[PDB]
Design a protein around this ligand. Structure first.
Ligand SMILES: C#CCN(Cc1ccc(F)cc1)c1cc(C)c(NC(=O)OC)c(C)c1
Ligand SMILES: C#CCN(Cc1ccc(F)cc1)c1cc(C)c(NC(=O)OC)c(C)c1
Lengths: 143, 354, 354, 143, 354, 354, 143, 143
């Protein structure tokens, strides 16, 4: 909406420091390390290419507002999350014990902090069982 | 400086331990140096060339021993990088490993010999060459292949051993007196082994026509069964390498699964409208208008992670696709069961509204 | 005591028959003892070492013969464990087996020789070595592989035999007079066999340049086709071992299926509310608040059996998963057909309610 | 229910002889051999683990009552029993002759007695055919 | 009598042509007789044994020639069984086949020789041995395998030929003067061929140390690449036999499909209530209460044919099950599309009835 | 004429570059001519046959050099056919390719030699033989196979090298003094190589019984591991050829996909009723009652393209059919999800109409 | 029905010449060759086994009437006939040209006569096309 | 219809220059090269065989009118077009960038002209995105 458009303009200005309406991979990297994380030049390239649609090496505002407006539903992440949890499901039972998440979530890839995994179990342990089912869990993520 | 010192310690430990790129070339070069030292030892054993061979061998061996000493020193020192071993105590504990024991006894034996010597020097060359592997990967692969195909190898060995014994004994009976090659059963057995292997030195061979005929009929089968194990092992090597590649593929899948789950949770936990999400925003704040930017970067990370994980779900095998699709087919079965129940409800209502 | 005696008889029968664990090591050791006896006979045939070789051989052979006698005795005695053979009559009935006949003739021949001797002793060594297998497993595998790949082996043998005959005859024509190696076609054929097999003793080889050229052109093909059968048999060995493993996997599936069905029936027949179930409770009562405990233990057994059977439904093969999923897919087809019928009924009612 | 929970407590006391509220593996083995069957220790670990949910090696009463209350339907034994009978179905016809059950049921795994197989055929030979179809049999077991 | 004569003619034609059972043993025996004749010729070429060798060879050869003549006679005579060739004209037309031409030229050559002779006799032995195959099955398999793996064989041959040429030339340069084995490049090339094949006669080998080193470095690769083609051909033989078995399986499927369709039509055309079915009843009447009996027979035939066709639908392969299930899955897709259309119609009526 | 000149230039370029049919036979013939030139060089090196050998060699070599010169000229001239290189400048730029550099340097070396010569002539024979490949296809295949199976080859080489070194050293220790074959470790290592490869020249072999025993026990393993790499490479060759065939199949699929899409669009853009389609009719008009004819031709083209593409969708592999069917199954999942949502809508209306 | 049962008894008597109520393999073979066809003893064993349900080598009247009464619908021949025609469908198009049937029907297995194939095409060429869809053909056969 | 039948008669006369009612392969080839394209004799044989139903090598008018009347719906091109675009979908995402079509469509098989690809993108870029989904695209060919 109009207010969302204004917020997206604020975000674009925060990113597009030059104010040319196209986010530079260097601008993105600078803001990223301002947030406290260093990417790789190739990593930023893949990110932008993922969001890029005009094949220009930058993002015009239409693409940016599309990216903000793209809710996870149109992304269709159901099958991907199902498959990932299945990969981490060593039993095939359709569930997974809490300790396995506490370990892997915090020791693989972009390791997550204690608070994040705590809210993870909070929203996943709706039944308070610990042996959370990943299938229903991705369903609840979707909704 | 100190942080750079730790970074270089970790880099050196990685290079000396299982390397990936240029450290591979460094290991190739050290192996080549040891190989050239062995070649110069070979030439030294030659008489007419002994002079220059030994002259170059002494200096090449001094280079080899200094390289070995410094490499072991650096390996021990960098052993502190890993969380398992840290400090001087940790480095000593790492040195307690049997492989480091092999290396250190080799080092001391070489230094003692340098500061009947040919026997010890050649031995030490052989042990260091053995040590080159550094991981037992070749040995582990060979042992795994032998164990996996234990039955084929055992039957081949049994049949070939019977063929060897029988052929040698029959030829010995046939060629006991007429031919001086087979004066004893031990000679006949040596001939049998040298023939069935197809080495055929020619120092022993049947000459009596009955002996020649028996040898022909038996060495046909003998050479077949002595060649068997080589082919069995080749096939087993291929199979085991394929299986190891499959496992590596599945671990390369395992890590991006965690990456995607992490990023998806963070993005789902960075929704602007949704409340109670500060448990996630605080992480980025600790890393550090800004809220929308945080959401944008988080969703960007989630999308890139999704693309990478999806690319990580390559088939790689019929089994893999069949398994994934069978899981999906189980979901499909559940959905059709739910729709069966819903139509059951509708047909049950039918009476109510009719 | 008597029950313990029967238990030990069964254990001894299992050890002497196809073993699994430490009995495997015992069989390895008896085979090693026979192998050392054969090696010492070999050394006895050597002249200069004959003294100590025979001195140790006599005692090792007495040990071997006593071990063989006692082993056959205990095998016959424990033959009564199996339900097929029981009692002295049953043990004799088992002894009528051809393998036991082989073993007993070997035993009596050895005892007669002990109480031209080298010929019989070596023959007996070879026959006992043959007897070591105890199951024909290696022989059965080899025969099965030969039969399965009969066509490839037959074509390889035919082509190689033609190559041998043709090359030998052509070389004999080329080297009939000039070279004294090939004075007769029999010599030429022996040379051809020794060459195509790649043994290459060197006692016969062409020297006439036309003969050398013909030999080269023909032995290329000849060595290729003489090496064929070894590779064919290696591949067949691998394939047959895979098939046997598949069958063993399916029997390991067969038994837990019965286990699960049994436990599931019992638990379904131990429901407290349901009546007419005494036909099941009576079994547990014979084994012997208690009713709920019986239901608990029965359902626990059912769940453990379920998990065991499920893990026993490992894929193990593309064919296996495809078959299971195809059964599921036929079930799904039936379900969708039923739902098609339901929608047909609903659309038929439509006119009734419209 | 309340009467059910009282029966559950009676059973738990019958097992938990110590009365500590946690069934020990040795307590379970003792009661079992009282019933007249000898398991293996490792078998006891496997079953207790199957029912175990707290990773403690024992069962507190909540897990025990969940174990009793788990009706076969939530167990979802349909597919497993289908596959088992299919394994024992050598024809793929979807049926199996009675004599095959009479033999295998009484000679594989935990062999069953004559009475059990008789009631088995009774509740399976609803059509009185003998060539019982395992599919409808597992469905009727479910209901 | 005459019908029995035709039956026996057909049976004889089948036996002489591709046989299945005991005719296979007869062919094995005729081949064995030819093989023994060849062995006796071999022994005749030996001097000291020439007397009895030729004494037995003459009679064995007369037996062989009479057997060949009578076999060709009966083959020509029974050629009339097949619908392709009938009568004396048909038998001559069959005789026009190239294989019959080969057989007849061999027969006349043998009769001319019997009624420098050793050269022709041995040649004709070889040609009859070639003729034994009778179908080119081995030759067709070998050619098909070579063509299928043309690229692997060609690359192996190219690389190995380069290795042979290069190694021979380098050794010749290294051993031109010092060693008398390599006086000419032709000798060096013969040595290279005899070495890379691993025959290693030993009549020629390098002695100059530079030559020895070059030979080592080159013959490693050379022996590897000379061994390649044998393994390639073995694998290709296995693959081609698998494919041939697959085709035979699918033809064994093709025939029962016709059987099932025939029986199914006949039974569907033997329903008592349905009319216009006399077009089927007439067939059985020509073969000849009776109507119901005919329906019973027809339905019995249909059920047996159905079972036979079903057991003829063995998987035999992942591809087979995948294909059958994919046909079923396309059917399922069509069914669900129809049900989608039906529910679309229902929702469209929704507005009508709402 | 000029158009015909360009057509013939393209035809000649295709023939000289990767050919398909009769140009393959032409390349076979030029290779055969080079091979015969090499054979005549071999015979020239022979002394007694030198006269006629060189007499024919000179003329055959003049033919070879003229053929090489004219072929290179035609290749350079026809290099203008390809769009990459056109004109004299383009032909020179193509000549800048390294392969053309090899060819031209060989040509000038030959012309210089023709207008110690044996060494250069034989060398140039070898380099031209190398050049015969013209695409490195064999070399690329061999390198790809080596890289793919790098682990199996490396483990085999490591184990075999250790076996060679150890066996040679042990035998040298055993046979240092007694046997004059092993006077130096270099001789022992040469023996080890010549034995483990199974060449077995026979110029060196152990004679001391301890040496013979050690040699036997070690050369068993040694010959096994020296034979390994040949089998590994054979299997890798088969696999890589299979993969290349798969890729070629998928490109043969890729092109008909474009054909079908083109024809389908054109037909969909040639519907008579639909307007705004002139964008397609104009293309056919430029190629040039007539409108319906154009529509008929376009739909005919579409149907033929559809058929060709469908037969281009052969399975060729389990993975292939699994991929296509899994795509279809994803569409099926989407359709059933849509139907789930639709029946959800119906049940939600239920309350509205109840 | 009753009249059907009487016809069934007439057929059984026609087969069971001995009148013992169990059709012998030899009785079946004799009647078969009376109709003008020679089976094999093993073939008769296979057919009787197919119909046999009591494992006696003969057929009691209940089994006989069950066998006659088995309408093709319950036989579930749809899949088998689909598969057979598909096997004979060398194209996979879902149809088959008339001449192909005219040949294979009359040259494979139990070859059929001209009249049989003519009525076959009559009931298959409902559209009068010749390229009969075997799938629709089996569908109409079922009904 | 009648007017469509007259138009098809005009087309047949334009093809069947002889006017014998059967379009010869050579007549088809002559007209084809008149429109400005040369086929191969085997190619013409394949086309005629595709349309041929009487196995005569030509087409009687009934087959011709059936050919004209065959709308793409009954042709069932959905799966085939889907699979083709999938083959050209190097990503499996379910879409394809415009430049890929601009290249391949104009450089593979029967290369088409610029105007053709332009109308292609026009009817494909209904959303005006360029990354057209081939699935919806084949669907709207169907409709
Ligand atoms: C077949 C046959 C012969 N045998 C069995 C045998 C057992 C005892 C003996 F004293 C002699 C021979 C055999 C053959 C080979 C190729 C090897 N080498 C090997 O396996 O490398 C992988 C071995 C280790 C044994
Ligand atoms: C190819 C070829 C040669 N032949 C056929 C042949 C037939 C009769 C002869 F007198 C000589 C040779 C051959 C080759 C091998 C390796 C074997 N051994 C074997 O199969 O081991 C598994 C045999 C048993 C025969």
């Amino acid at each position: 909406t109009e207010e969302q458009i204004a917020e997206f303009k604020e975000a674009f200005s925060l990113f597009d420091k030059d104010g040319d309406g196209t986010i530079t991979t260097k601008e993105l990297g600078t803001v990223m390390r301002s947030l406290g994380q260093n990417p790789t030049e190739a990593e930023l390239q893949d990110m932008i290419n993922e969001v890029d649609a005009d094949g220009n090496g930058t993002i015009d505002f239409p693409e940016f507002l599309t990216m903000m407006a793209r809710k996870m539903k149109d992304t269709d992440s159901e099958e991907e999350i199902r498959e990932a949890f299945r990969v981490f499901d060593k039993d095939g039972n359709g569930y997974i014990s809490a300790a396995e998440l506490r370990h892997v979530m915090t020791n693989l890839g972009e390791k997550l902090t204690d608070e994040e995994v705590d809210e993870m179990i909070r929203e996943a342990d709706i039944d308070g069982d610990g042996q959370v089912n990943y299938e229903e869990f991705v369903q609840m993520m979707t909704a | 400086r100190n942080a750079f010192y730790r970074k270089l310690q970790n880099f050196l430990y990685n290079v000396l331990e299982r390397p990936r790129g240029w450290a591979f070339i460094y290991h190739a070069y050290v192996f080549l140096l040891v190989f050239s030292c062995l070649v110069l030892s070979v030439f030294s054993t030659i008489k007419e060339y002994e002079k220059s061979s030994e002259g170059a061998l002494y200096i090449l061996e001094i280079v080899t021993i200094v390289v070995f000493g410094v490499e072991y020193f650096v390996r021990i020192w960098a052993a502190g990088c890993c969380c398992r071993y840290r400090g001087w105590r940790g480095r000593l504990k790492f040195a307690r490993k049997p492989f480091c024991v092999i290396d250190i006894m080799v080092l001391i034996a070489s230094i003692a010999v340098l500061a009947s010597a040919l026997r010890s020097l050649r031995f030490l060359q052989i042990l260091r060459m053995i040590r080159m592997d550094r991981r037992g990967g070749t040995w582990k692969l060979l042992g795994s292949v032998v164990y996996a195909h234990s039955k084929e190898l055992v039957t081949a060995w049994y049949i070939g051993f019977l063929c060897l014994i029988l052929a040698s004994f029959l030829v010995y009976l046939a060629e006991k007196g007429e031919n001086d090659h087979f004066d004893t059963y031990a000679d006949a057995l040596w001939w049998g082994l040298i023939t069935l292997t197809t080495i055929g030195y020619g120092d022993k061979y049947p000459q009596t026509w009955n002996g020649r005929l028996l040898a022909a009929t038996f060495t046909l089968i003998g050479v077949s069964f002595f060649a068997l194990p080589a082919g069995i092992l080749g096939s087993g090597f291929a199979l085991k390498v394929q299986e190891q590649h499959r496992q590596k593929h599945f671990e390369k899948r395992r890590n991006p699964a965690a990456g995607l789950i992490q990023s998806a949770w963070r993005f789902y936990a960075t929704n602007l409208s949704r409340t109670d999400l500060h448990s996630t925003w605080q992480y980025y704040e600790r890393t550090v208008g800004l809220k929308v930017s945080i959401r944008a970067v988080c969703v960007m990370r989630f999308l890139v992670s999704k693309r990478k994980f999806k690319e990580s779900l390559r088939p790689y095998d019929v089994m893999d696709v069949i398994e994934q699709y069978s899981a999906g087919h189980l979901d499909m079965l559940s959905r059709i069961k739910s729709l069966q129940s819903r139509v059951d409800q509708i047909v049950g209502r039918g009476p109510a509204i009719t």
